Write a protein that binds this ligand. Structure first.
Ligand code: CLA
Ligand code: CLA
Ligand code: CLA
Ligand code: CLA
Ligand code: CLA
Ligand code: CLA
Ligand code: CLA
Ligand SMILES: CC(=CC=C/C(C)=C/C=C/C=C(C)/C=C/C=C(C)/C=C/C1=C(C)CCCC1(C)C)/C=C/C1=C(C)CCCC1(C)C
Ligand SMILES: CC(=CC=C/C(C)=C/C=C/C=C(C)\C=C\C=C(C)\C=C\C1=C(C)CCCC1(C)C)/C=C/C1=C(C)CCCC1(C)C
Ligand SMILES: CC1=C(C/C=C(\C)CCC[C@H](C)CCC[C@@H](C)CCCC(C)C)C(=O)c2ccccc2C1=O
Ligand SMILES: CC1=C(C/C=C(\C)CCC[C@H](C)CCC[C@@H](C)CCCC(C)C)C(=O)c2ccccc2C1=O
Ligand SMILES: OC[C@H]1O[C@](CO)(O[C@H]2O[C@H](CO)[C@@H](O)[C@H](O)[C@H]2O)[C@@H](O)[C@@H]1O
Ligand code: SF4
Ligand code: SF4
Lengths: 220, 161, 81, 138, 730, 69
């Protein structure tokens, strides 16, 4: 069971770092963008043409990096606990023939051992934990709502705000009424961040409430 | 007389939008809205303040006295004021620090009338800070107050059915 | 910089090469010898937005421009309105 | 407007162009010639006709009003002409100035192309720390 | 192109680099053009600048679908035949649990093949043949084995009509570019002469050959292969040989009858598939219309007619170019074809049309979600292709000042509204649920939104459902029950294995899903509407019809200038709809099992797959993984070592494939370049790379390999999640 | 020419922008300074945001015998 996770924490800091090593090993420039500098870091984007050029600032590889630091630092943590859990108020055979595969990592752990928490808002009144499970769905939203930021890309947003800032100006009981900052859609690096700095809490606020919400009950 | 006014997109030139249809500029509506701050600034903002404060006032009651947080109240301080004599207050300076996006600092007094106005370039601003005060000051005494002949009115109520 | 993306190349000839890009680029300013003799990288750039339509066509052989300007008016993004 | 009605470039309605920020700041407008009564394409989505006058349509912002060319020169004509209107007058004489047709020679005007050193080995990063005494304000 | 026009070779073009725009695939080597070639393979801005052909291709490379649908179906009739279980299942329904497919026991395989009914090893079915197949006014395994080759007949032939076009020197313009008659024909006699013809082979033969099946026998103890001719003597049991009537009309006497039909509504006690004594009448009563109807008409005339004040002057002239488009007269269609498929998905589950469905749970919900993803996957399309119109199709601008030129006139407008529509919804349409959590986890029910706390009181009833099941007392004639048994009023007794349909109650937890749908259906459409509308020109880019309807993104400037376009509005509009449908599904089964599906026994004490757990507990959106996802799915994650197992064993992949999409969806592009070289380097040292310039993904290809994966991932996930919680209890 | 009716009263016409109601009820300076202190507005708001908002919250939270959460 341990001769795998232990090779899959090893496929993490490696992949994570081919991208950081790379990220770094030319914030300077390269063939596609040769003179990539005087600003190096976060210049996210470039024009279309050449081959088609994108998240090729050493920041956006950092940007890209932080997903595997959020996937190692999960395989690893994930692992302890399942182990510990089982190695407490009960067995260990459990992690033994049931971590040598994959489905099961989802079924018993993930699916076994959440029990306690979720039937904790229960149709039958607020029982033991409530902070936690609401956190845990607060966990699943903050996450998901990363995606916009992430599959949206300033173009589509700005443009309907072009139509949506023809409202006010053209509607009574809301005219003259001036903004002092001109309605726009988020910068073309900014939203790679915000989806992230969003992807992250969701994610890190879900295990936060996941483990607790189940190492506490137990059984272990 | 025509097909629909002397047929026009806007007041005139069709390169501004507005696409003056009805729901925009039918004498049927555009008159239901100009004793108030639609086309022309009557008296100053001073008075309009409280018909605005008050009308919008005795609203927000059954909204937060019939949809209140634990609802249908048996507390003699609800079916009215209760708290919401908070909204008008959380927003009677939601305004004042928007009239800080207005400064322009004067004192003319021209709510009395002279020569059939226009206020001319009346569009854009041309209402300084010492205006937007006497309105959002009309607002507080329109908000708080307009909350009590709501409250004060007993409640003779029509019901479901 | 405030509009500083380099599309330069070496021919700066502009026939079946490049024209595209809203206003910004009133060049043909023949430098004392560069083949079809019209050169440099721009004219007065304080006018329009941030394309890279700028290359897409006719060489920059190195980079190609994109957004890099930061200091960014509005007239310099469609939306100041 | 009407009491003065001076038009040229036919249209009827539209929720497209010009709105609040073309008084309170800048204006921008294109003008042109044409032969005989012809139906066009338009910026802002719509579409109308021509004949003459000044043939002087006014336009929101200047990327908008040159696209009469990016099609409105696939429909005959030397002459098309856009300036810059303020809420009061001039400086920025937009298609005015000297010659026209971006790709000729009278003068050189601006541009340059180089910075300090040219495209060559700027593996050299950012140099001095930004300090008020060594020619890096250009 | 080039070699070697034009008159001078037969000798075909096999060999000489390229073809497809003109500094084409260039001599000089590259990879991008290998996704080019397949992508945009069908398209039209290239092939020729001249209509003509294209309609001469699409009427051919069309054809090879029918032929295919035809090679398909054959391997399904064959399959639903000699890989039997149909013979076995029919003498023995309520009992069986059908199969058609079976492995071969190579490697691990066999676990997949697990006793299904009339005594054999195989993998089940949720694709209701074995139930169209009730039909067979005949029965017999080798028989379907004729219907089967009858299939391959139509094919080879209805596939040599596609040789017998494009490749044969083709028709032309007039032929389609006279439209004048087309629907005249289509709807009249096929639409008609099928439904018609279907009538004749829907009482002749089928009705009788399940009129006395709905009882017992073992087939060929019934329905010979000819038996049903002139012999109008067994047609004796199921009404007269007209006795003394002659070709309807009235000088007819009924002292005791009224031909077959004698209209039903409800559900056979013994086979609740809705009555057949009707099924003839309704198809007959169709065709007539079509039979009369397809007799317009010749075209403008009718649309060149009704205008008004604000109405559509261009209504009049609504497209010469509707004989000169396609991309237009396809996109219109998809909205209908598509929107006219998921209207199936209801009339099905609340009115079964085949013997043994409902009882058969899993063999008609599969359906109601398969049919459900087309009445959606065909609609975003029905927008895409309008965008494809809106950008290009016509030659110049000859089309002018009309209904459209109108709509566009407003455009920062029709979409100005619609927007607020959605945030009004969303706030009334989702945070609605979130109240509950925040206040049921706070915990004070007094004040939730329960089907019982916020004021609504033990009844939903008084609306229109309750004036549907009760309408057989209007102008209504009647016929015991309703129209769809799921309506408010009366009746119960439906089926003697398990259950079928019964009322289906509402209020809240039916009230608000029904509303999330609104907001979900709406913001889907916002993005497609504004997408196709702003197709060609705008005040972020006006110079913006200048390539095509794709194009990656105009460029870093203007602030963003990325997504824009409308390939992409038809890229983030898929992204929603995957929800639109993916949550509508989530709706039906949680209802249809929380209530309805469940089961009779003595005193018919009803026992749903779940004692209505829905009640107070979908209203909480956790209840949606307390009661759903974590509840059911316990059958997916138990499913190992079984027979179905291929679901649990998919449910990890495809629940992986999705979680691979994000990498395609979430990432740059000169990135995998910058990477693809490090690679290309190590490659050259050994001397192993350059030839065919290896290149990263074509900005928008990249988005193509998002999306498509995100769906074939995020989707079959449930296709598995499902078949695994109706097979086995439910 | 009968339906040439000389536009049965022209109107004048265009009423106006001119003049289709007098104005605002005479109720005014029946508030002259009445409620001032936003009609002495000459430096304030900081006052009403310690004051008003320390008495929508001071006593507003506290209570002598719960009626709890
Ligand atoms: C879970 C989701 C997250 C959220 C909340 C949203 C929300 C929205 N998306 Mg969206 N989107 C997402 C993920 C999300 N998206 C992802 C992952 C993708 C692609 C992968 C997209 C692709 C997309 C597209 C293409 C579009 C949208 C649009 C929209 C808007 C639709 C109108 C609406 O109902 O909004 C308002 C309602 C909500 C956001 C839901 C309720 C939120 C609750 C929690 C209430 C909170 C309010 C409360 C006062 C909090 C204050 C308390 C204080 C402590 C702060 C809405 C803003 C569209 C649009 O703008 O049309 C109008 C547009 O079509 N999205
Ligand atoms: C009546 C309908 C039908 C028809 C005849 C067409 C025809 C056309 N469409 Mg179209 N379309 C449709 C419905 C239709 N569409 C629908 C419903 C949508 C909504 C999704 C679209 C969205 C769409 C877009 C965005 C585009 C087109 C384009 C086109 C043109 C390009 C065709 C091509 O090269 O094939 C394309 C097919 C391939 C290259 C094959 C790849 C298929 C992959 C993604 C597999 C799908 C997943 C599946 C599970 C994999 C197989 C299983 C595997 C796991 C083993 C062509 C004229 C394109 C164009 O540029 O216009 C000229 C443009 O790309 N369509
Ligand atoms: C049941 C409770 C509660 C109570 C006691 C009231 C009482 C009142 N509301 Mg009210 N309201 C409530 C909840 C409540 N509301 C809620 C939850 C909302 C949600 C928006 C409103 C929205 C609302 C509006 C928009 C208005 C009122 C109005 C009124 C007042 C005028 C009575 C009338 O019909 O004009 C009598 C008219 C003539 C005799 C002429 C009245 C004192 C106003 C009003 O009713 O004026 C018509 C104003 O219309 N309410
Ligand atoms: C249901 C689907 C289907 C159908 C009916 C067609 C039909 C067609 N495709 Mg096609 N295609 C499809 C799916 C389909 N495709 C998919 C999924 C892809 C992947 C992108 C392609 C990629 C593709 C390309 C690149 C080309 C076609 C072409 C064609 C046409 C050429 C017929 C021919 O030359 O000889 C018929 C030959 C045989 C029957 C010989 C036997 C070959 C095997 C596969 C059987 C025909 C209209 C060609 C075209 O442009 O025509 C419109 C073109 O070269 N297709
Ligand atoms: C609609 C679909 C299509 C699909 C997906 C299948 C799929 C399958 N067929 Mg099949 N088949 C089809 C059309 C299809 N067939 C048609 C039109 C015919 C008539 C020619 C057949 C005649 C046929 C036979 C005779 C057999 C199959 C068998 C099979 C299975 C063997 C796998 C294989 O072909 O390669 C490996 C597989 C489940 C095999 C089977 O059932 O044994 C398990 C059997 O060999 N098919
Ligand atoms: C489109 C139709 C379909 C087809 C191909 C047929 C064909 C036939 N029917 Mg028929 N039939 C149909 C629909 C059809 N029916 C429907 C919908 C009904 C009831 C609504 C009937 C009720 C019916 C009866 C009562 C009889 C037939 C008979 C026949 C046979 C000879 C007489 C005839 O109808 O036409 C040919 C026309 C002439 C011979 C004149 C012929 C095989 C008769 C038969 O058995 O053979 C003579 C007779 O028994 N049909
Ligand atoms: C835009 C212009 C022109 C105008 C000014 C109108 C005005 C009207 N149409 Mg109308 N109509 C028009 C063109 C026009 N139509 C055209 C061109 C068509 C054909 C496309 C129609 C088809 C039509 C229908 C079917 C109806 C109307 C109705 C109406 C009336 C709405 C009912 C109402 O307010 O009283 C109700 C007031 C109460 C106090 C009660 C209103 C007078 C409706 C009507 O007949 O009156 C209800 C009816 O719905 N119209
Ligand atoms: C030739 C014919 C015919 C017919 C008939 C017909 C011609 C029929 C047809 C029908 C059709 C139909 C009946 C249709 C069907 C369809 C389907 C079945 C489909 C389905 C589906 C859907 C739903 C969608 C998609 C998918 C699928 C495909 C599955 C005949 C002719 C004639 C003549 C001249 C001579 C004398 C006799 C007669 C007879 C008079
Ligand atoms: C690792 C793997 C795989 C995996 C896989 C996974 C891990 C996953 C996958 C998945 C796939 C898929 C998934 C496809 C498909 C499909 C289908 C058939 C579908 C269908 C459908 C429909 C019809 C529609 C929608 C729904 C559904 C989905 C159901 C492999 C690997 C390998 C190696 C070692 C090397 C060599 C090669 C190989 C041998 C290859
Ligand atoms: C929605 C969206 C927008 C639109 C911009 C929006 C919606 C801003 C809307 C404001 C929200 C409602 C503010 C709420 C945030 C609060 C937590 C307050 C922030 C406080 C800060 C000072 C930290 C983009 O501009 C964009 C750009 C590039 C990629 C993706 C996207 C994208 O997904
Ligand atoms: C991962 C990723 C890549 C990298 C993905 C690549 C390079 C996938 C292409 C790999 C090809 C399909 C491998 C083909 C090689 C084999 C076909 C050759 C051998 C033949 C067989 C016998 C194996 C992008 O190029 C990209 C572009 C734009 C947005 C996002 C992304 C993105 O997320
Ligand atoms: O602790 C909250 C408790 O105190 C209130 C707040 O108004 O007021 C009390 O003060 C008056 C003053 O005389 C006392 O007579 C009496 O205890 C309350 O009126 C009361 O609401 C709250 O119950
Ligand atoms: S490289 Fe570009 S624009 Fe530069 S000189 Fe040539 S074409 Fe001129
Ligand atoms: S590249 Fe830059 S300068 Fe050139 S046109 Fe585009 S925005 Fe203007």
């Amino acid at each position: 069971g341990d001769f795998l996770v232990h090779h899959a924490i090893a496929l993490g800091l490696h992949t994570t770092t081919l991208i950081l090593v790379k990220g770094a090993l030319d914030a300077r420039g390269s063939k596609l963008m040769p003179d990539k500098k005087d600003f190096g870091y976060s210049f996210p984007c470039d024009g279309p043409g050449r081959g088609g050029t994108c998240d090729i600032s050493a920041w956006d590889d950092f940007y890209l990096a932080v997903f595997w630091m959020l996937n190692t630092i999960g395989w690893v943590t994930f692992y302890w606990h399942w182990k510990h859990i089982t190695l407490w108020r009960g067995n260990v055979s459990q992690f033994n023939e049931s971590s040598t595969y994959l489905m099961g990592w989802l079924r018993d752990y993930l699916w076994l051992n959440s029990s306690q928490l979720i039937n904790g808002i229960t149709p039958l009144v607020c029982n033991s934990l409530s902070v936690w499970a609401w956190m845990f769905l607060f966990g699943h939203l903050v996450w998901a709502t990363g995606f916009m930021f992430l599959i949206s890309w300033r173009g589509y947003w700005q443009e309907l705000i072009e139509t949506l800032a023809w409202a006010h100006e053209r509607t009574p009981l809301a005219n003259l009424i001036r903004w002092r900052d001109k309605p726009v859609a988020l910068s073309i690096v900014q939203a790679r961040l915000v989806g992230l700095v969003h992807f992250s809490v969701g994610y890190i606020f879900t295990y936060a409430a996941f483990l607790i919400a189940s190492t506490s009950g137990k059984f272990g | 007389k025509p097909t629909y006014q002397v047929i026009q997109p806007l007041n005139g030139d069709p390169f501004i939008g507005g696409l003056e249809t009805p729901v925009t500029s039918s004498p049927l509506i555009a008159w239901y809205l100009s004793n108030l701050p639609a086309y022309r600034t009557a008296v100053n903002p001073l008075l309009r303040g409280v018909e605005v404060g008050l009308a919008h006032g005795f609203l927000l009651v059954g909204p937060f006295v019939k949809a209140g947080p634990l609802r249908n109240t048996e507390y003699a301080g609800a079916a009215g004021s209760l708290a919401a004599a908070g909204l008008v207050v959380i927003l009677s300076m939601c305004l004042t620090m928007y009239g800080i996006a207005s400064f322009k600092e004067g004192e003319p007094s021209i709510a009395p009338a002279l020569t059939l106005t226009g206020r001319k370039k009346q569009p854009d601003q041309l209402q300084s800070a010492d205006g937007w005060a006497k309105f959002t000051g009309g607002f507080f005494f329109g908000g708080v107050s307009g909350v009590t002949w709501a409250c004060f009115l007993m409640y003779v109520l029509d019901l479901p059915y | 910089m405030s509009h500083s993306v380099k599309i330069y190349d070496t021919c700066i000839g502009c026939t079946q090469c490049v024209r595209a890009c809203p206003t910004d680029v009133l060049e043909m300013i023949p430098w004392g010898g560069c083949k079809a003799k019209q050169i440099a990288s721009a004219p007065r750039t304080e006018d329009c937005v941030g394309c890279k339509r700028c290359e897409s066509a006719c060489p920059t052989d190195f980079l190609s421009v994109r957004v890099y300007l930061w200091h960014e008016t509005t007239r310099s993004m469609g939306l100041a309105y | 407007e009407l009491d003065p009605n001076t038009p040229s470039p036919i249209f009827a309605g539209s929720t497209g162009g010009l709105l609040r920020k073309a008084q309170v700041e800048e204006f921008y407008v294109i003008t042109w010639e044409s032969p005989k009564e012809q139906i066009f394409e338009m910026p802002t989505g719509g579409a109308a006709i021509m004949r003459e006058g000044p043939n002087l349509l006014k336009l929101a912002r200047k990327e908008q009003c040159l696209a009469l060319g990016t099609r409105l020169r696939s429909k005959y004509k030397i002459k098309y002409q856009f300036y810059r209107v303020f809420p009061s007058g001039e400086v920025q004489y937009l298609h005015p100035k000297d010659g026209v047709y971006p790709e000729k020679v009278n003068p050189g005007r601006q541009g340059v192309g180089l910075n300090m050193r040219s495209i060559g080995k700027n593996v050299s990063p950012i140099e001095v720390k930004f300090t008020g005494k060594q020619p890096y304000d250009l | 192109l080039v070699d070697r026009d034009p008159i001078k070779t037969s000798f075909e073009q096999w060999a000489k680099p390229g073809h497809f725009s003109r500094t084409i695939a260039k001599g000089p080597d590259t990879t991008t053009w290998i996704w080019n070639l397949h992508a945009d393979a069908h398209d039209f801005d290239s092939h020729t600048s001249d209509l003509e052909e294209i309609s001469r291709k699409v009427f051919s490379a069309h054809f090879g679908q029918l032929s295919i649908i035809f090679l398909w179906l054959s391997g399904m009739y064959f399959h639903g035949a000699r890989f039997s279980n149909y013979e076995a299942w029919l003498n023995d329904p309520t009992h069986i649990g059908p199969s058609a497919q079976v492995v071969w026991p190579i490697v691990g395989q066999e676990i997949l093949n697990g006793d299904v009914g009339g005594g054999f090893r195989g993998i089940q079915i949720t694709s209701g043949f074995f139930q169209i197949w009730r039909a067979s006014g005949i029965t017999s395994e080798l028989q379907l084995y004729c219907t089967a080759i009858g299939a391959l007949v139509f094919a080879g032939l209805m596939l040599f009509a596609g040789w017998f076009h494009y490749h044969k020197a083709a028709p032309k313009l007039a032929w389609f570019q006279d439209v004048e008659s087309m629907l005249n024909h289509h709807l009249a006699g096929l639409l008609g002469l099928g439904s018609l013809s279907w009538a004749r082979h829907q009482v002749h033969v089928s009705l009788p050959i399940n009129q006395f099946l709905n009882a017992g026998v073992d087939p060929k103890e019934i329905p010979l292969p000819h038996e049903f001719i002139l012999n109008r003597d067994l047609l004796a049991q199921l009404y007269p040989s007209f006795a003394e009537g002659a070709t309807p009309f009235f000088t007819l006497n009924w002292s005791k009858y009224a031909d077959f039909l004698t209209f039903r509504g409800g559900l056979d006690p013994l086979t609740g598939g809705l009555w057949l004594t009707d099924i003839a009448h309704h198809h007959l009563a169709i065709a007539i219309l079509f039979l009369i109807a397809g007799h317009m008409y010749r075209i403008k005339d009718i649309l060149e007619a009704h205008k008004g004040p604000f109405t559509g002057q261009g209504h009049k002239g609504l497209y010469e170019i509707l004989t000169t488009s396609w991309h237009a007269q396809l996109s219109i269609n998809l909205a209908m074809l598509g929107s006219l498929t998921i209207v199936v998905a209801q009339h099905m589950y609340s009115m079964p049309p085949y013997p043994y469905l409902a009882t058969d749970y899993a063999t008609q919900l599969s359906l109601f979600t398969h049919h459900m993803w087309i009445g959606g996957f065909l609609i975003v399309g029905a927008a895409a292709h309008a965008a494809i119109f809106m950008v290009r199709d016509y030659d110049p601008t000859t089309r002018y000042n009309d209904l459209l030129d109108r709509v566009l006139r407003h455009r920062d407008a029709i979409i100005s509204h619609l927007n607020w529509v959605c945030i009004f919804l969303g706030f009334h349409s989702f945070g609605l649920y979130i109240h509950n959590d925040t206040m049921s986890a706070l915990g004070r029910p007094q004040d939730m939104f329960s089907d019982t706390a916020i004021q609504l009181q033990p009844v939903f009833a008084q609306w229109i459902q309750n004036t549907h099941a009760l309408a057989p007392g209007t102008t209504a004639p009647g016929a015991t029950a309703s129209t769809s048994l799921t309506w408010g009023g009366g009746d119960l007794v439906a089926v003697g294995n398990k259950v079928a349909l019964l009322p289906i109650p509402l209020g809240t937890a039916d009230f608000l899903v029904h509303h999330i749908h609104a907001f979900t259906i709406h913001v889907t459409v916002l993005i497609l509407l504004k997408g196709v509308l702003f197709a060609r020109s705008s005040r972020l880019i006006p110079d913006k019809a200048n390539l095509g309807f794709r194009f990656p993104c105009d460029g870093p400037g203007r602030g963003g200038t990325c997504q824009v376009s409308a390939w992409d509005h038809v890229f983030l509009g898929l992204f929603w709809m995957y929800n639109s449908i993916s949550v509508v599904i989530f709706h039906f089964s949680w209802k249809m099992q929380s209530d309805v599906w469940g089961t009779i026994n003595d005193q018919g004490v009803v026992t749903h797959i779940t004692a209505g757990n829905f009640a107070q507990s979908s209203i909480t959106i956790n209840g949606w993984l307390r009661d759903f996802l974590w509840a059911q799915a316990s059958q997916v994650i138990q499913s190992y070592g079984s027979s179905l197992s291929a679901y649990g064993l998919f449910f990890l992949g495809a629940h992986f494939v999705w979680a691979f999409s994000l990498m395609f969806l979430f990432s740059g592009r000169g990135y995998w370049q910058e990477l693809i070289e490090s690679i290309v380097w190590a490659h050259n040292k050994l001397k192993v790379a350059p030839a065919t310039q290896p290149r990263a993904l074509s900005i928008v290809q990249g988005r193509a390999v998002g999306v498509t994966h995100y769906l074939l991932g995020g989707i079959a996930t449930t296709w598995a999640f499902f078949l695994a919680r109706i097979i086995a209890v439910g | 020419d009968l339906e040439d009716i000389a536009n049965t009263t022209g109107q004048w016409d265009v009423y106006g922008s001119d003049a289709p109601s007098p104005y605002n009820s005479l109720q005014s300076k029946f508030f002259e300074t009445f409620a001032a202190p936003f009609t002495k507005r000459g430096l304030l708001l900081k006052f009403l945001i310690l004051g008003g908002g320390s008495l929508l919250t001071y006593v507003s939270a506290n209570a002598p015998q719960d009626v709890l959460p």
